[PDB]
Amino acid sequence: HMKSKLPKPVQDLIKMIFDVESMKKAMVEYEIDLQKMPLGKLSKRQIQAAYSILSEVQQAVSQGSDSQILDLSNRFYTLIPHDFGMKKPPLLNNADSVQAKAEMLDNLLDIEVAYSLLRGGSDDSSKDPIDVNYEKLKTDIKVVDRDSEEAEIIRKYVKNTHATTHNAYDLEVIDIFKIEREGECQRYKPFKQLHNRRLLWHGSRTTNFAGILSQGLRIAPPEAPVTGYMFGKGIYFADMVSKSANYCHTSQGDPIGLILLGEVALGNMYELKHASHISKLPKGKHSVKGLGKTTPDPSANISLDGVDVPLGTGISSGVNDTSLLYNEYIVYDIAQVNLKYLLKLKFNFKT
Numbered sequence: 185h186m187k188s189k190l191p192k193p194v195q196d197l198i199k200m201i202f203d204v205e206s207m208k209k210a211m212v213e214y215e216i217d218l219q220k221m222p223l224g225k226l227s228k229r230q231i232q233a234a235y236s237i238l239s240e241v242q243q244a245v246s247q248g249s250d251s252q253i254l255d256l257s258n259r260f261y262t263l264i265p266h267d268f269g270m271k272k273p274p275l276l277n278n279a280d281s282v283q284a285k286a287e288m289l290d291n292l293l294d295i296e297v298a299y300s301l302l303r304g305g306s307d308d309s310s311k312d313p314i315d316v317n318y319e320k321l322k323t324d325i326k327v328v329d330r331d332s333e334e335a336e337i338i339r340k341y342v343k344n345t346h347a348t349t350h351n352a353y354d355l356e357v358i359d360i361f362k363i364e365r366e367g368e369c370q371r372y373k374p375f376k377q378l379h380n381r382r383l384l385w386h387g388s389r390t391t392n393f394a395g396i397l398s399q400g401l402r403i404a405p406p407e408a409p410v411t412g413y414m415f416g417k418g419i420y421f422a423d424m425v426s427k428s429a430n431y432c433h434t435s436q437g438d439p440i441g442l443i444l445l446g447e448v449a450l451g452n453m454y455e456l457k458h459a460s461h462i463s464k465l466p467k468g469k470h471s472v473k474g475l476g477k478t479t480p481d482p483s484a485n486i487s488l489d490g491v492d493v494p495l496g497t498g499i500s501s502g503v504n505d506t507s508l509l510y511n512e513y514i515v516y517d518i519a520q521v522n523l524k525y526l527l528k529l530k531f532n533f534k535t
């Protein structure tokens with residue numbers, strides 16, 4: 185084929201995100217049975233129905249028996265086959281089980297998108313499939329130059345916001361990309377001038393990235409159990425790189441991850457300290473801020489293209505009896521995010 189004119193790092197990025205074997209690896213990591221539920225048999229309506237059953241299990245847990253629950257638990261395993269042999273699978277009887285499976289279903293939702301892009305589409309052996317796959321993202325991706333001003337600010341954000349409690353690894357920034365999802369600038373227009381616009385981190389496993397870049401960051405669907413998400417069904421960000429970077433789920437065995445930087449229109453924050461499984465915001469609020477015990481030093485906030493970058497070292501927030509060690513931000517309308525950058529990270533596991 186014609187061999188592809190995209191920069192090496194952009195090509196390596198497309199290779200990672202569309203990797204089929206990585207998709208399967210993630211599925212077995214969640215205990216799915218690939219013989220009963222292969223990648224190609226994944227569908228939306230099956231994920232949705234599984235989300236529904238998990239909402240049934242949530243109802244029964246909220247109202248308190250291991251016996252009346254057995255039936256609900258079993259229905260979930262009927263819909264999403266797990267790898268337990270001739271079995272008896274573990275009982276889904278608590279809040280932890282609902283959170284754990286809801287996460288699993290979130291990931292399947294993005295993997296189904298990635299796989300559908302790979303199998304929709306046309307087949308032309310004279311084209312570099314790198315080029316073919318890039319185009320399916322409907323996202324302009326450029327390499328940010330190491331000596332630019334935006335590179336220096338991003339590297340400082342990474343450098344300053346690695347929490348001491350996440351010191352089991354550190355991060356090197358391998359490549360910084362600037363990304364522009366088609367139509368997203370247009371979608372964000374209503375919020376483009378809102379107060380409290382912040383540049384924030386969103387980490388996810390590499391196998392979700394094709395979905396995120398084609399569809400943007402999305403909210404978990406109606407069917408999904410609201411209780412599976414600490415502040416309900418929104419899009420979640422951090423101001424500490426290490427808190428987002430933990431959601432990459434990298435390891436010694438695959439230590440390259442991907443992390444986003446999004447412009448997030450927070451406006452008037454509904455500030456909270458403990459779990460609140462809300463489905464709408466109080467009138468007049470635009471976001472939730474989960475209040476951390478530690479925050480980037482407010483006084484070291486800097487500007488990048490008109491947007492606040494909270495890149496200070498962590499200090500005490502002064503907030504007292506909170507569930508959260510670090511800040512968390514949630515928006516509940518997809519149009520309040522505009523994705524700006526994508527970092528490829530190398531994780532040095534010190535353990």
Ligand SMILES: O=C(c1cc(Cn2c(=O)[nH]c(=O)c3ccccc32)ccc1F)N1CCN(CC(F)(F)F)CC1
Nearest residue numbers: 290293386387402403404413418419420421422428431
């Ligand atoms: O932002 C999230 C989300 C993400 C997390 C976990 N999480 C996370 O995965 N990455 C983070 O950087 C993060 C930062 C602060 C707090 C939580 C974070 C927990 C609940 C959530 F609702 N979602 C849910 C999965 N969504 C995909 C879909 F299933 F709905 F499609 C993307 C939006």
